[PDB]
Design a protein around this ligand. Structure first.
Ligand SMILES: [Fe+3]
Ligand SMILES: [Fe+3]
Length: 247
């Protein structure tokens, strides 16, 4: 399996602190059946930027260490990009990374609202042949209050990625209930760890898949999982008709 959102690169962000942490996360990933991780460090971390060159370097260095440690995991480059006005321009200047250099780009809304220009940005990116992937829409306060916002963005061509932990319940009962609503409505296209460490914000990959299998049957989690394989290959992901969700 492929994990498309993960903070396994050390000293970049709020995920692994150092390379020893990265290695522990990698071992956990492997135990969960993950063979390939797209590292998605935040493009900004405080006062610092994690430029594309530095991300590629860090992924290359982590891969060398994983080989040294005999861990069967391959880390590919990417970024988690908090939305801002100049995403389309900065991408064209190669000052941002898409996921594994594919057409899929991981865009995160601030936790409290969906910026008003989001739809316009996403339209612009599609016209350039990108597919914006909304990070953890279930963790957004405004989508939670008004899920129709996600429905519309997805109807208009956006994809989204749910967090394994949300489905697994490790972030609470409420997040799980909401996540199942989004999945049912065909508004989710990927499941990913968003792992930051081994103990609290960890993978919960199999746990999430089991929840999906129990709730929807075997074919749905297969579809979500294969979507990560399609993404990796820069193929077009599979979608079901999006549906409004209420409340
Ligand atoms: Fe995030
Ligand atoms: Fe993240």
């Amino acid at each position: 399996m492929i994990d498309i959102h993960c903070h396994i690169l050390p000293a970049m962000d709020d995920g692994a602190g150092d390379s020893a942490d990265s290695i522990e996360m990698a071992r956990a990933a492997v135990r969960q059946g993950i063979r390939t991780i797209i590292a998605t460090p935040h493009h900004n971390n405080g006062v610092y930027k994690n430029e594309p060159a530095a991300v590629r370097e860090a992924a290359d260095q982590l891969n060398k260490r994983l080989i040294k440690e005999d861990i069967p995991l391959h880390v590919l480059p990417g970024q988690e990009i908090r939305i801002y006005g100049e995403v389309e321009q900065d991408l064209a200047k190669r000052q941002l990374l898409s996921l594994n250099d594919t057409k899929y780009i991981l865009i995160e809304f601030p936790f409290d609202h969906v910026p008003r220009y989001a739809e316009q940005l996403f339209y612009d990116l599609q016209l350039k042949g990108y597919i914006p992937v909304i990070a953890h829409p279930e963790r957004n306060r405004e989508i939670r209050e008004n899920p129709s916002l996600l429905y519309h963005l997805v109807e208009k061509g956006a994809a989204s990625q749910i967090t394994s932990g949300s489905l697994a319940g490790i972030f609470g009962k409420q997040l799980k209930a909401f996540s199942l609503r989004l999945v049912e409505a065909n508004l989710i296209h990927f499941v990913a760890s968003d792992a930051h460490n081994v103990k609290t914000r960890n993978f919960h990959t199999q746990e999430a898949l089991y929840v999906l299998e129990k709730e929807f049957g075997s074919e749905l989690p297969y579809m979500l999982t294969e979507n990560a394989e399609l993404l990796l290959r820069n193929q077009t992901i599979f979608r079901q008709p999006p549906q409004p969700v209420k409340r």
